[PDB]
Symmetry: C3
């Protein structure tokens, strides 16, 4: 998947960014089976005051997670995954849960490309990994924490 994470500049230190990425990644790995290296977390920083809620300019505590997923999982799994992200981003960022927004969007794997390769359907990532060329496997392997 790709998790776009919209935060205010200077709200998360580099280590807090690492912590937030590891929380989102571990959650997605834990609940779906997808290997760590297929999960990207992409922080998008904007000056504080760029978020408005109901017309009121905000400080810099709001966190918006936009999660882009392959189609094919159940509503039940997706709810657990969103709740676990709320949970673990709150702990990892030391920010209260009422600041955390999480939307999941879904697309057919047939129109999703990671590492220059089309994604498999959500249960099939094991065989998929194996007919990647040598180098592709070696490269992805290095992206695991």
């Amino acid at each position: 998947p790709v998790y776009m994470v919209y935060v205010s500049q200077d709200r998360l230190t580099p280590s807090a960014k690492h912590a937030v990425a590891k929380a989102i990644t571990d959650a997605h790995r834990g609940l779906t089976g997808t290997q760590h290296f297929l999960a990207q977390v992409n922080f998008q920083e904007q000056p504080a005051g760029n978020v408005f809620l109901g017309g009121v300019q905000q400080g810099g505590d709001t966190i918006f997670v936009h999660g882009l997923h392959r189609e094919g999982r159940s509503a039940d799994l997706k709810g657990q995954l969103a709740q676990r992200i709320v949970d673990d981003v709150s702990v990892a960022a030391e920010i209260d849960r009422k600041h955390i927004w999480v939307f999941f969007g879904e697309m057919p794997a047939q129109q999703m490309v990671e590492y220059g390769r089309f994604l498999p359907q959500p249960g099939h990532e094991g065989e998929w990994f194996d007919n990647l060329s040598s180098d592709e496997r070696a490269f992805m392997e290095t992206n695991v924490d």
Copy 2:
């Protein structure tokens, strides 16, 4: 909903950001009934010259509104809401409507979290707000302009 608003750096003054947010938020409330505090406007500023139309680098005048909505509304309602955002943002920011792009994406409310809580379906915002904590309602009430 979350409205992501893609604009160039220094194109909108802070007063214009407030007026554009208010404009999007009032149109959304006026046409859907969703309470003000549930509508987020998130400005993503980039240096002018980062937008290309037909391969031709632009100045800093294009505005792309990307609305992330719950599923359940009619095509006619989304059409009126898209058009009102066009008209009202054009007025708020004093920009010709030909600079304004607006896309709506929808997701099930079941996979959509705001203020740390799962959203209801689009007609049930009343019941939903009546079963939040006292604190949660209070934090939420402060985000109305």
Copy 3:
């Protein structure tokens, strides 16, 4: 369409941004037939280190293209469009394909607005253009390269 392109700061020069924007616009136009001026490429730059793969912070090499399309095209056409974007962007940015992520999201044209006007169904771009007013057609025409 709108192509959101997430790249690291100072990884693409002005000229490289242009080439990547031309690669995408040409790939889209070749394969779909949509006029050049209807294809927006919108570069979102963030400091290097804001991208985490498997929870591993990246340099500034990763590119994520998020395509926002009208519904109505075949899975095979979109597979050819995604592959050609990956290929052409690889040459134009001088970046290995293993760094390129491409996702397509689709929405009904009835909730999609470009240049302040609702988009037509795919394939209906020609007739659509002529019942635009003279000045709208004229502003649009200037965005071809």
